[PDB]
């Protein structure tokens, strides 16, 4: 899905403009490329070029890496993280939980996403009170079921006013919020 979106953007002029605004980095299955790309990514954050690291939620990079101040400032989530519904391994794991412990397939399936999504979006708040905004580019997160299964600390900050901001509307609040955090305590 990442490649398809990347290719689609590449055909249009959207991808090129993003390259102009900021450097762009992408993740691959091979670990060797991932380490080099991330190693370069850190340098870009230090410098003023910036970087946009595309990655996969299940990627070992997402779990292994930790984002701190001036690293992964704004975590962007493109789509609710769901595993493919064809891998037969999950079925025995999934359907069994329905038979034993009485968990609905959708409940665990959605729980498999919010936990996975929360894992890959809770890094920006590592420590030392370093500001950061977590934007989830999917209307599914706006559903009450997703919001409830979201961790309490993130959810309580979230409000209905900004729950379903438009792309233009979401950008404007992001700009304003960063201003407030820029000034000292």
């Amino acid at each position: 899905y990442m490649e398809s979106t990347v290719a689609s953007w590449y055909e249009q002029g959207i991808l090129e403009n993003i390259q102009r605004n900021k450097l762009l980095f992408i993740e691959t299955q091979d670990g060797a490329e991932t380490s080099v790309a991330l190693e370069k990514y850190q340098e870009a954050c230090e410098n003023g070029r910036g970087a946009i690291l595309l990655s996969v939620a299940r990627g070992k990079v997402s779990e292994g890496i930790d984002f701190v101040h001036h690293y992964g400032r704004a975590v962007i989530m493109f789509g609710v993280p769901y595993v493919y519904t064809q891998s037969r391994i999950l079925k025995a794991r999934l359907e069994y939980l329905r038979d034993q412990f009485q968990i609905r397939e959708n409940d665990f399936l959605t729980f498999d996403a919010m936990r996975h999504a929360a894992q890959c979006v809770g890094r920006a708040i590592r420590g030392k009170t370093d500001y950061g905004l977590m934007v989830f580019a999917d209307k599914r997160f706006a559903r009450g079921d997703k919001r409830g299964k979201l961790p309490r600390w993130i959810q309580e900050h979230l409000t209905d006013a900004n729950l379903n901001l438009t792309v233009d509307e979401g950008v404007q609040v992001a700009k304003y919020f960063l201003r407030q955090m820029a000034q000292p305590f």
């Binding site: 102009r20 230090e46 410098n47 003023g48 001036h70 700009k175 960063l178 201003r179 820029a182 000034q183």
Partner: protein, 329 residues
């Protein structure tokens, strides 16, 4: 707290594309230039001995819009000209900072070199890594205090604190006026800062000796017509139209007594007057500062003269007059 009275400050303005965005009520570039013009004149009006020089960076290249000079009008003219600038390209801190470094490298040690980068587009495409340039700046003791716009850029954060400067982000247009005006005042001298005596020259206004006898005709020194009378130099002996201006030959600063006296009040900051809203046995209806009835429950008083001042009086006194009227007696 030691203060560096003389300072060569560069207001690096970025001609980046992001300046096109009209986040402020007028165009972002125009608002800075319009307000920066206020800063330029005010800066000279609060530090005559100092001089300023503007660098404009765009399309990954830095061009000196106006070299160091002591004439506020000359710099002001450049600002208005830049209002029509195309404003297309991408800035380069290394290019901009390097240009400032080259001209400021040869500046005298006693004067406090400073740079105020008005950063607009968060990106910084530079030919060389900027962290290396930081090492040079600290050795060159050039203070760089960025004022970011709509972004808390990381690289400039270390730039300000490592180099000694301060980092800020514009909360709004009203807050923007506050920030630049703050930088107008000379910054305190830190441990790295060193002070040294500087040669100074005081000219006297001169005119025709007696009925244009043994006159001293001359045109100017930086379409000037003949001048019957004007300022001169102890050493250049070259006519100067306006002061204060650096010698074009001696290299020794020319400046009259009043200009120096304009900077004395910095050495003598006015202690803030306690605000006591209640009357506090102040039976004088008329404000001593302005001889006007106190229409608000606010009063200010010194620790020496113990006088009474209304809101306008105290606000004015600390802001511009920089001295207590009654407490002078």
């Amino acid at each position: 707290v030691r203060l560096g009275m003389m300072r060569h400050l560069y207001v690096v303005v970025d001609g980046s594309r992001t300046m096109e965005d009209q986040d402020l009520k007028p165009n972002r570039l125009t608002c800075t230039l319009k307000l920066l013009e206020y800063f330029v004149e005010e800066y000279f009006d609060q530090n005559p001995i100092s001089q300023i020089g503007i660098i404009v960076t765009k399309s990954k290249r830095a061009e000196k819009l106006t070299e160091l000079s002591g004439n506020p009008r000359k710099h002001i003219t450049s600002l208005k000209k830049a209002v029509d600038m195309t404003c297309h390209g991408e800035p380069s801190l290394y290019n901009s900072l390097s240009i400032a470094m080259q001209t400021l490298k040869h500046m005298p040690g006693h004067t406090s070199r400073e740079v105020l980068i008005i950063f607009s587009s968060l990106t910084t495409c530079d030919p060389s890594n900027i962290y290396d340039l930081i090492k040079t700046l600290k050795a060159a003791k050039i203070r760089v205090s960025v004022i970011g716009l709509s972004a808390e850029v990381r690289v400039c954060t270390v730039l300000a604190r490592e180099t000694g400067g301060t980092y800020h982000v514009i909360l709004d247009e009203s807050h923007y006026k506050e920030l630049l005006t703050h930088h107008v005042s000379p910054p305190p001298a830190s441990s790295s800062s060193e002070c040294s005596l500087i040669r100074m020259g005081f000219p006297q206004h001169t005119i025709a000796s007696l009925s244009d006898q043994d006159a001293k005709p001359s045109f100017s020194m930086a379409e000037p017509g003949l001048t019957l009378g004007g300022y001169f130099c102890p050493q250049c002996r070259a006519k100067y139209c306006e002061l204060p201006v650096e010698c074009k030959i001696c290299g020794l600063t020319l400046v009259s007594a009043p200009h120096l006296a304009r900077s004395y009040h910095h050495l003598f900051p006015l202690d803030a007057f306690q605000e006591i809203p209640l009357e506090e046995y102040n039976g004088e209806r008329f404000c001593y500062g302005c001889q006007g009835e106190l229409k608000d429950q606010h009063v200010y008083v010194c620790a020496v003269c113990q006088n009474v001042f209304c809101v306008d009086c105290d606000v004015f006194v600390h802001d511009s007059l920089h001295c207590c009227p009654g407490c002078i007696h």
